[PDB]
Amino acid sequence: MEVIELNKCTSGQSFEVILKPPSDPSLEEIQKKLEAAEERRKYQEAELLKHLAE
Amino acid sequence: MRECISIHVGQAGVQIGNACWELYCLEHGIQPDGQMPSDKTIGGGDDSFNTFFSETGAGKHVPRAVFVDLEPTVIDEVRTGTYRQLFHPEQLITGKEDAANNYARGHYTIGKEIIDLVLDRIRKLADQCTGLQGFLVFHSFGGGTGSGFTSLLMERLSVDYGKKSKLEFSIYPAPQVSTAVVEPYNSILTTHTTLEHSDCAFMVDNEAIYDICRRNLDIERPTYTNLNRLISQIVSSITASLRFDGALNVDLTEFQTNLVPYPRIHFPLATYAPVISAEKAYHEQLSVAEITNACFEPANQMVKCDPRHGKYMACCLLYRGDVVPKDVNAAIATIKTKRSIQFVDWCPTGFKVGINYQPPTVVPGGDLAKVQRAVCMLSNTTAIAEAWARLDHKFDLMYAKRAFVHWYVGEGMEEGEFSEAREDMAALEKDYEEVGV
Amino acid sequence: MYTFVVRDENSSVYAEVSRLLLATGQWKRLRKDNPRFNLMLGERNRLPFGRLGHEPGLVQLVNYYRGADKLCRKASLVKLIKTSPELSESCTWFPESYVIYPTDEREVFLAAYNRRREGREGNVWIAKILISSEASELLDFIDEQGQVHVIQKYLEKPLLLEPGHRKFDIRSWVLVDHLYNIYLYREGVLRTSSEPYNSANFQDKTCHLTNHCIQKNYGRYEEGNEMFFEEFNQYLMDALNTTLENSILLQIKHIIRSCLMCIEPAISTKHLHYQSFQLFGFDFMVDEELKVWLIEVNGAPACAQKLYAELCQGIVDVAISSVFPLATSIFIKLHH
Amino acid sequence: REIVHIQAGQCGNQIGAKFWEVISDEHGIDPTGSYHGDSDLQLERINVYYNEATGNKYVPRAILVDLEPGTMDSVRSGPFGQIFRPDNFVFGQSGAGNNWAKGHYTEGAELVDSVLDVVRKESESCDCLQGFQLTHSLGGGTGSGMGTLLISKIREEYPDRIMNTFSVMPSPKVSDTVVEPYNATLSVHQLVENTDETYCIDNEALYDICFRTLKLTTPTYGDLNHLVSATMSGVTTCLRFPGQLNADLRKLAVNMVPFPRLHFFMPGFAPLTSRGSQQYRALTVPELTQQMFDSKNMMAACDPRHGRYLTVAAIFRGRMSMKEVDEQMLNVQNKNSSYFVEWIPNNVKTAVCDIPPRGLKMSATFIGNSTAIQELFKRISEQFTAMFRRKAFLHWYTGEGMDEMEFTEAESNMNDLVSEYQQYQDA
């Protein structure tokens, strides 16, 4: 019913119609998580090469 | 004027990006070589289209966009594509081997090797900006790169651009064109890690796009090209307010303001109409009332769900073509008495409307017919949570047996991150329910 | 070969349906967590409607309408009728009722309650259980149990069956298929009282409440305190010179259709990716002037032992086999 | 993404040569190494298996291995014998006498370093090596013993690469010696630990198919290898031609292997055909789908109804209705959903390739990870135990330095593998 904030221009127009009223981690922490995960990969690869060495 | 940078990650992101930037060019009258005859401010300017294009002294208009994929196959087709001259090399970043449908491999292993390079290539674009608003990120949920590398990028952007807004365009996994069984894992994982770093995210379920193409375009077995040309039309409707003169959604911050009252619940549902086949010999053009009414048909939504059994927090109507406010208000009044539209008590029951007189552009040779008026509705309804429910159920079935988990643990990810991600999703589903019932 | 799943074991109605389906040799039952089903006989609580209709290559159907609980919950039925224009707020076939919360429209109820007092009208009401003529006798009871109840005007002048001078209520079974056709089962049942109706003392609730549960003078006049339509019709003809159709059933058909058409746009699965049907149990009440009143709607009704075979077979024919065809009718179509 | 191919022993080289023969024809490569095809689809991913040489000549990235020169001399004089890089012929003179120990510990240990020098030379030419595929039998000495030795040493030097194998299982119906169950059990132990993907090619199944279905009264190894080469072509189609699904060895592994040890696949194929016997009638898509799933078409003598599918990869080849394919693929799953584990949603994936194989207008190749595969290992274990309980024929092995304990461990690990497969069949 109530049309408001009507704005017009050559390209078009915009408006709002109401029907009814109402009723971060740091750079440090990121690299640490990425490098910690890289070590877990290194440990796993080492255990394998150890196993293969046996 | 404030600039926007578009980031395209993984196959899905890149190929959707190509569809969109192709469409953008046709809408602004930019040619494949980057020349824009209508632009009379040679070598620069601060027009509304400059939000997405920078300019060179030679009069070339280049996308403020970076393409990134951990495998060269897809971006190589950009480098040699019809719009090869549009972009320049440092915008197109490729690795050697991909993430193999593995989030952990995309985030931790291979992601660590290329994150610094990508940020540097992004920083170069940001340096050419007088007022950077933020970023539009295109990616899949299911891919290893789209999921894994994206979340890492979004984390760093929040550090390197803390004040800037970040919007997502995300492809939700659909078995009909899926390429991996573990895509539910990747989806939950990338959502959990990206959630606090995203201000607004537009989800597109490939299932919905697939069936629209089959049902309305009479394409028996849609290709990615079919899906993407349809998606770009939606994306174009959403971003048109950033690239054209107007007073609705003029910057990124306004997307959050108008569509996202609660930060975590930042996944608006998109509904688009009309989708008409080009090969359709005889077509009766649809009215403002008919296309507006179609916005409340589930068969036209980007995510199949039932908004009748949820609550609205916000609702925007974005028209393109022959449309005036009078016909819209008449349409809304009629629809309101016929359909079930419940807003949350702490929100006004209303609609923000935007009209652009330019009717939607269609790619020559495409599947879409030209129309005299089209509309895209952006509604923040709790009903979209049905998609989180489907996804988490599949996640629970596989994780109960720890199936495929060893692929992730073998890349340096802890098993605990699976359950941390899943509990974050459990909280998200509960949020939607508190608000919605 | 169609497939289905069972997620409500306590359902006597659909226990019989799953039986019949298997006995066709064209339906195969799967495990409860198998997603590759055609038909879902779902649970009563938190039925995952959101996971339906997302299986490529499968037409899916469920035996419940999402959103139909607004009709089948007492607090909701009152709110629905009062707020819906199609049922106004001056709806003539629903007893005056109010939504009351433990410590809402309590003040509004008193603006009705005391209105009767000063106006010298009947003042017996019912809490949903406590039949009383004093308000605070009721308001004290609802706050004592725990959660929300409904206060409703008690029909002090019910139709009374002779022999016995007894009270009764009518149960009608209604099936709504996927096309939102409204089918009324031709066989209904009168769940009667056996101890004569006592107008003065309300607290002994054996003659006031006609639930098949409570009264088990049982089996005196009727086998099971259940009078079917052929007998009730014959009684109406002999004792009142009218029929069941004219005096009662027209009102029943009218009330059923009005209720379900009010909520059609909110629950219809016409253009949905999955489909719904559902069996309802409408409970009606007849006063001495042969005026039918709606009491409630049951979303998960049980049937009567005689009628299980016929009704359950009926469900397969028009609700299931209509969607999934295989290699005179017992329903009345309430047209619209 | 280059793949390095290795073929070891008599069987390994005989199917390996047949494999290069078949796919060379599909990629339009003649025995000279010259391309003579009419479609560009043929060359788009030909780098996966072929190295590019002078005069635009294509040379297989293949390494031929044996402890005797007999079979490899037959390869070099065979049809496509000249296409292979002569330096990649690495052979001893002593043979392995169908003895795992000789291949793994003595005779083969003497030769293995020479082989790894060639592997290394090939690997450094690769822009991005994705991994290795080995062809061999498990019933002999070289392919079984030295092949698994090679695998172990390749994993040591390339621990982040995918190891894939085509492993021919022994069968009494097609048997060279009594000690094949010994050789096979020792090999399976190695494979469980050191490969990501193993195609179980059962000589029992290959025999039965030839006899029961193809009506070949007395099948030869040549007949058996018709089926193997047809299967090998199909399971590598997604790697050799452009596509989005299972295009590299790692993505296949991630989609097919929910648990690291359970990576032994049942290959299937349709239509089944004998050599020379010309087929005139092209199968409909429903027919291809039904047959490729039937036990009679499985290359591993296991009843898939005795187990459950963890994962499935299917590849249809030829000109056909991709809509009909998806319909039929969905029908199989929806009609027999019990034989697919419910705790891996959407575990069946399908690819389609326009190029059919030679002689057929269309075909379907099946790759199943079923728990029913345990029947294969149980069968080997029973034959193993029958002899081992009496320590029969063990002197052939103790004579090369092996101890009885090593047999006991191998036996125990294969029985563990069996029980693991059984664990998920009742989940």
Ligand SMILES: Nc1nc2c(ncn2[C@@H]2O[C@H](COP(=O)(O)OP(=O)(O)OP(=O)(O)O)[C@@H](O)[C@H]2O)c(=O)[nH]1
């Ligand atoms: N709509 C649409 N979806 C796509 C497209 N390409 C891939 N997808 C979807 O994305 C998911 C797979 O993610 P991809 O983007 O292909 O993989 P990626 O991002 O490259 O990650 P990796 O390949 O594992 O390194 C699947 O669900 C696909 O259906 C596309 O062009 N359009």
Ligand SMILES: Nc1ncnc2c1ncn2[C@@H]1O[C@H](COP(=O)(O)OP(=O)(O)CP(=O)(O)O)[C@@H](O)[C@H]1O
């Ligand atoms: N307003 C009213 N006036 C007179 N009698 C009433 C009444 N409301 C209910 N009754 C009587 O009380 C009984 C209570 O049944 P209600 O349907 O209210 O609860 P229920 O849901 O536990 C029984 P069912 O589900 O089997 O119908 C009715 O069958 C009817 O006989």
Ligand SMILES: Nc1nc2c(ncn2[C@@H]2O[C@H](COP(=O)(O)OP(=O)(O)O)[C@@H](O)[C@H]2O)c(=O)[nH]1
């Ligand atoms: N399918 C097939 N199997 C073979 C062939 N040659 C040998 N075998 C099988 O492999 C086992 C013998 O191993 P073999 O390859 O001859 O031993 P190796 O030369 O020392 O590696 C037995 O189980 C045979 O049935 C062949 O050409 N084709």
Ligand SMILES: [Ca+2]
């Ligand atoms: Ca300019």
Ligand SMILES: [Mg+2]
């Ligand atoms: Mg990719």
Ligand SMILES: [Mg+2]
């Ligand atoms: Mg009840």
Ligand SMILES: [Mg+2]
């Ligand atoms: Mg031999």
